[PDB]
Design an enzyme around this catalytic site. Sequence first.
Site, short mmCIF file in Angstrom:
data_model
loop_
_atom_site.label_atom_id
_atom_site.label_comp_id
_atom_site.label_asym_id
_atom_site.label_seq_id
_atom_site.Cartn_x
_atom_site.Cartn_y
_atom_site.Cartn_z
N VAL A 46 0.74 8.39 3.09
CA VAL A 46 2.00 7.61 3.07
C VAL A 46 2.32 6.78 4.33
O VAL A 46 3.00 5.76 4.24
CB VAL A 46 3.24 8.49 2.72
CG1 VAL A 46 3.27 8.83 1.23
CG2 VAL A 46 3.30 9.75 3.59
N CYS A 47 1.83 7.24 5.49
CA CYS A 47 2.09 6.62 6.80
C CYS A 47 1.47 5.26 7.09
O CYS A 47 2.21 4.36 7.51
CB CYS A 47 1.61 7.54 7.92
SG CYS A 47 2.68 8.91 8.24
#
EC number: 1.11.1.24
Lengths: 164, 163, 165, 163, 164, 165, 163, 165, 164, 165, 165, 165
Positions: A46-47
């Site tokens: 997700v980052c």
Amino acid sequence: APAVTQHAPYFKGTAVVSGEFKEISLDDFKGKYLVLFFYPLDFTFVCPTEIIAFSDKASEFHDVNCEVVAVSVDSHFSHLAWINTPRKNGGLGHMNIALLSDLTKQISRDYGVLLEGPGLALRGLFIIDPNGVIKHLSVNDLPVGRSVEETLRLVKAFQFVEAH
Amino acid sequence: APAVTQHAPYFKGTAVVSGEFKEISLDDFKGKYLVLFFYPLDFTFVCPTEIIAFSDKASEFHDVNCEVVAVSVDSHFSHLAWINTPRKNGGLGHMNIALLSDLTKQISRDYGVLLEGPGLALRGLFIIDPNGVIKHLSVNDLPVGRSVEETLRLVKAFQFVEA
Amino acid sequence: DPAPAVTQHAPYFKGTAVVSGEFKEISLDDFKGKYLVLFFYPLDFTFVCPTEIIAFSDKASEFHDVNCEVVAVSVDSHFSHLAWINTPRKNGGLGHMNIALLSDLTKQISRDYGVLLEGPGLALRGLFIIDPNGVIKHLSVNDLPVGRSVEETLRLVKAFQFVEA
Amino acid sequence: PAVTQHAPYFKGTAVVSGEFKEISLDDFKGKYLVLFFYPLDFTFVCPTEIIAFSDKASEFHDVNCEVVAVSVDSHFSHLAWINTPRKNGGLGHMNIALLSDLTKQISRDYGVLLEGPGLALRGLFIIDPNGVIKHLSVNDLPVGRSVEETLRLVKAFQFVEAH
Amino acid sequence: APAVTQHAPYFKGTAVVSGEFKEISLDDFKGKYLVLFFYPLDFTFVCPTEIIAFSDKASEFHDVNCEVVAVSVDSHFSHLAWINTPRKNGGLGHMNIALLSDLTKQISRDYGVLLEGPGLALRGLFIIDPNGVIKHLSVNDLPVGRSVEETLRLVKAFQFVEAH
Amino acid sequence: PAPAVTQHAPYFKGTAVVSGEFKEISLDDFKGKYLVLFFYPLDFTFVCPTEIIAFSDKASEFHDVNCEVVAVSVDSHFSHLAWINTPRKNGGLGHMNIALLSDLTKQISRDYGVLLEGPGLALRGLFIIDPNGVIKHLSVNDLPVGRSVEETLRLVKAFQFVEAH
Amino acid sequence: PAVTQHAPYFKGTAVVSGEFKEISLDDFKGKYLVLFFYPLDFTFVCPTEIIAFSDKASEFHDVNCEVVAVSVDSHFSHLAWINTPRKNGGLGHMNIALLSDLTKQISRDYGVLLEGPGLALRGLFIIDPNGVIKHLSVNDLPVGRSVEETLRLVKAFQFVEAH
Amino acid sequence: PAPAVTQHAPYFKGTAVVSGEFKEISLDDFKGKYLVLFFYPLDFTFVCPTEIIAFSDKASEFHDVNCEVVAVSVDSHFSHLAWINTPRKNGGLGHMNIALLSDLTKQISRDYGVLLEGPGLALRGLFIIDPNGVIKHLSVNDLPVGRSVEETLRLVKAFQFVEAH
Amino acid sequence: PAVTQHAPYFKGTAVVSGEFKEISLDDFKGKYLVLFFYPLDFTFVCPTEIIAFSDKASEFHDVNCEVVAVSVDSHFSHLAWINTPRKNGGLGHMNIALLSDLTKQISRDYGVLLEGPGLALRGLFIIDPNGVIKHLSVNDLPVGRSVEETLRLVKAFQFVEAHG
Amino acid sequence: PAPAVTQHAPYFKGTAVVSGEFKEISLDDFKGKYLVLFFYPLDFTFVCPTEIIAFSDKASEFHDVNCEVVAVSVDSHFSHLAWINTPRKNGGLGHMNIALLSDLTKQISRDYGVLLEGPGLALRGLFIIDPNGVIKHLSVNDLPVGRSVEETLRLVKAFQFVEAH
Amino acid sequence: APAVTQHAPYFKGTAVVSGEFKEISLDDFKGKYLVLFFYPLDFTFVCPTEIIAFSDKASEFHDVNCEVVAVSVDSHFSHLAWINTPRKNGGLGHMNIALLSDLTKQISRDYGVLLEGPGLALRGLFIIDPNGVIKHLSVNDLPVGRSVEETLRLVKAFQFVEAHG
Amino acid sequence: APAVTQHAPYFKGTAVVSGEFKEISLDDFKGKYLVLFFYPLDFTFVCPTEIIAFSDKASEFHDVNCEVVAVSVDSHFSHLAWINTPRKNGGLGHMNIALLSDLTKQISRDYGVLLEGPGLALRGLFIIDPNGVIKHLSVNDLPVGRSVEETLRLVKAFQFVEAHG
């Protein structure tokens, strides 16, 4: 305190800057703008979208005397290993922004974004002015990345106010 | 702070076990000898030797009813990423031991090996018997690796002392 | 501040030792500027202890060669130490010693090093590698019946030096 | 511990007939007990008095009196001193119990412990069949006492309880 | 304190010395060995044999530089009256040792030999060296006699140590 | 319960010499009778005897009025007997018609407020205690001065009179 | 207060030779003093003793001794009782001081005050030239004491000082 | 209860001279009657008798209106009786129609707030106490000055009228 | 306040010869002072005593004695009662001072204040030239005192300072 | 319960002059009516009667809208009556159509927040209190200045209008 | 304190004066009389009648050395926008008096008129003299407006007193 | 608490909703997303752009189950007056979103956006899910407005995660 109109909490730690380890602090940014943003963990899916977009648009922030610095509770060694993972394997590849290590978790704590139970940071972003004053902050829950363009627009809107 | 003759402090967290994430705890080792060892950080050059040495000799520990669990303050994603880095490249490669994540740092705190200023563990090692009792502990400063052979020897020595 | 913990300064100690068949008072200060291996064992005239102590005495000159003194400690008196020294090795004794045998008659040294079992009144088998500045670099503790490798202890002392070079 | 008061409790490991045995004040109920202390095994000032008690032991046994020697040494040290021949400064075979006071609590409770060095003064107690102290004496470390005098006292206390 | 290796508690009182009242104290005995012993009461029949024995042996003590002092809680007038009763009548007859009155009982209390209940001393004995340090102490229950010869042997034994 | 006039006499118990024998007596033994309780400092001294001998010689005169006499000092009862067995020619007490009570523990003198703590002996106190145990009269003299025995008898009678009329 | 202790301080108004005068313990330094207490003016139990001390007062003066009578009445009651003739149960002429203890403090400090009724017991104190008590005696309220015995004692105390 | 107008008179009890006889009397003896309670310093002084005698001579007038008069001082009742038995011509009181109450313990003078502790005598207070024990009037004079008996009587009658209307 | 003790200090507004004047205890130093309290102006219970004092004021002044009446009424109420004719229940002309105790502190300091209703009991105080209280008396509300008797007491106290 | 608009008026009770008589009145007596409660500093002063007179002259206009009027000062009710009985020509009140409440203890002026503690009299406060005892309007003037009565009646009317419409 | 005779509490804030924003404070009014009055909220139907009547009469206050300031807890931006709303539409229109903003509510709090629950002021009015002393205050509940003519009369009456009696 | 992952603090107050005054609260939005955003003051040059942009795009939020509520410390009457001012004159004009009044300031305080000094809110915005959980917050300093398209994109991104990953 981490509130708008107040001076940003002082911080210091080891960052990856240009493939190298350097100790950086809030003091290093006096007289420029700073986007300081936090992400949960290195090596998670997700980052990197958000981190990369910041790297890609870094020149644009530099152009207006604004520095950018990404922070996570991971060690600077983990940061580097992830920077040395190429984007095609979900790494970061080269970075145009600093990757600050908050290994003690104290930075995330001081910026009010640390989740104490699991021990990692929410997605906080702070726009800090040349005197160390917080002009803008936002915080997203873990699954959702932010728009880098809106961050840039805000840095500019803030400078415009100062100039007029 | 843990002590030889005392019961080992309880612990639980996410480990990488055979390439996968598993929740593990001290209770999972009741009935078995456990070697629990701490190292500072993933992706540093001081530790892979020790962790690799342990993983290589892991079946020898398994043969004498002893598990081996390596622990650092890194997340379990750092652990898996280091396992997925070939040894020739300075990673861990395939692991025959568990790598437990101490992200909250509380396991290192409880085992008395947490350096609070930098927020990472000293190189503690604890041999825990089938009843959760610590038979042996040792701790080295950050830079220095230990002998796996000696750890194996100590384990067998404690087992010999049952008879 | 001083504590029996790695990265901390070793607690001060002083006591009567047997040194080359003679009684000598020694202390932590005597070892400043060199490495020290201080190790504890439970009791004189028990069968579990001499193998380790003799192995240190036998390797004492290899430790001295890398600037490291060795001192053994139990809660026995210095007279016990001396009697065990004067019992030949072929007879179950320690025989000749190249290392200091420190008496911890009051048990306070064992207490300060965190290895005393108060109830029965003797030490666990703890070992401490103390650097020239008096800082603990390594420690390990065995339950009473189990001896340690002197080879490994020597290798660690070498490695701490290697790493500060 | 003064005369006319009950003897403090003790319990510990003793060398009795070449063997290790747990003894306590209660083992002497119904008998006289001479309990005496000396400073340290393997010192030249002590064996003359301990050997004298050993030699005259059956004379005490003949009058329903037991003799126990005590020092802060371990029972392993006591046994090594017994296994040292008299000609070599040892105790040789003993007809009396050698009690180990490794914890020092016995010497503490009998009021004879020197705390600084951690050894006992040369104290001696005559304790009646009910565990009452009838007599006590103490000498500085270097000086041995008269065994025949101690026997005489035992006999005199017995005489008084009969007449 | 009254313990071996400690300095003997200070005392002062009126003694009978050679048929006369003389005030004495621990300081009078500096440089000398002192045998200080206690008995329960004058004009009783259990105390006398021990005291006469020390008296008959006093010169043997004097020859090795040692004094002997008997103490009870009686007044010094009682001590004299007792010394003035011939032995053939059950008295002490003449004495070669000092008889120290402990009328206040403070000497016996300080030496840890006073039976508070009836207010008389146990039979305690103290050998005190030339520096006032106790080298030996013993305490028998009230009836049982003790040995002059053994006390003498001990004095010599302490002196032997002091010399070699 | 205090040594003061109009108050109950403090309890006492001790060994006395009575008719040359030892007997334990106590305040209780005198309920129903008047009692003269008097204190003197020490046996075998030269000042106390006149008073004690005088109380003994006049003793039947006290009995005639239902009154006992008890002499007290801090000496032991053994001292008391030896002094009684010393003839009056020789400074002794000779035969005694009154009890000589021993206050070895000093507690009777203390309770009667006549103890001199410094030297540890009694002032010359005297107490006239009625058949109820009530102190009707006290006097206390410094050590070197003796009392008139006849004045004590007159005081006893005077108290009886007042009671009777 | 007790024999061998200094007499408590006193001060008050006394009737002396039919006049009011302020007297205190300090006035008697250098002289003996007989200080005695009686319950109350104008009661039939007291005058006999007080009268007897008055009649004998010259004898006391001849031995350097003053006599002072004390009660808790005022000095006006004292004077009135003096001005009452002896046959009418009064004191008549007095040769001794009659001290008023109106505040009751003197009886209080002398240990003779009965608090409940607020009057003194019949205590008598012989006080030496240095203010030290040598004798005290106390009678219940109805019983008078002997003046001759009191004089004997003053003399005996004087003999003891002089020899 | 306090010595204050409108409050209940403090309780008192002691021995009085009543008609040449000793009688114990108390505040309760006077319930249902008015009570003049006055204090004076001392018996046998040159000043006081005028007041007291004036009260005695007028006593029946007080009686006529149901009012008792009680004089108080810290003297004993024996002093009071001796003063009564002393003829007026000689400075005495002679015959007395009022009670002369002794406050020998001084507590009455204290409870009525008129005692001078230092000298240990009463100021000249006067209290008019009604049938229910409530103080209607008080006055206090310094030691030397006497009081009008006539005004006191007028005050009693005034309160009696008022308390009926 | 009690006899033999100094009168408590007071100050307030009085009606003096038909005018308002501040007076204090200090004003009576060297003089005798009769200070008396009455409950309330315009009550049928008080005028007799007040009028009688006024009618005899010259007799007090002739012996160096001032007379001051006090109530918790205002000085305006005092003046109005003075301007009310005697025929009508007034005071008429006054030869004494009428002191106002509006705050009630004067009555409280003299111990005569009834706190419940807030008016003074009928207390009277004879105060000497050094301001020492020589006499006090207090009556319940309904009853007046004798002015003659007060005068007599003043003269008696003076006699005693003068002679004995 | 406090002197603030929208809070309930503090409870009061006292003796008032009402139609030449003394009556005990309290806040409770005005339940279900409007009440104008006003304070003035002192009876018999030149500055207050104009205001009190003007309220009295308009009293029937307040009655007609179900509103009572009471004046309050710290004077006794005896002063109040005497000021009523003084003709207006002589600076008196003359006859009053409103109650004059006595606040002799000053607690009412205190509870309403208008007491000047130093001099112990009230400022010129006025309170319009509704039928439930709630304060709708309050006002306060320094001592020298009187208020308009017409304006107080207009306000009473205005609060009633708001209640109806 | 907001009490008559006391100095007025200090205030400072942004007001609209003559269509412009100006910081004003209590000190600005030194030397002048000041009518400071409060109203609940801008753009409500109750307040404008009083505020407009004050503005219409402002020249009468100015002619007697008197300023008038209106206060509410609204911002000065609301005040201005209310001024810029025609009277025709329930606006204020042109103002001849200052409209002070009390946005923090501290001024209404310091003046004792803040209703804490809803966060707005009661209709308090204060007349403050040239030295800053409160001569008169009044407070109405929210729905009732005061008479401006009566306020002007009071200012004048205070000045009259100052100039004479 | 106003932190991401916690429950939004409860609020309740008067809003203008479609030109009418309506009480609303956090409970009203259960089952829907809520965008709650703060602005400093009605009638300022700085805020309307952002308020109008939210209103112009309200229908895009409605269509993804999302309500939008704007908040300031102004009263609801100022809100309504700002709505009734035309956009050309700096007004809000017609609003498609609710304008919540925070007159007490407690909402801004509970949401951590109240500047206590001036008494107005910073420009905070919170995205609150259907269970009342804060998913996103941002705060701007007073002079700067936000992108409404970026707020909408976030609402959609949270919905997307909730529906998939």
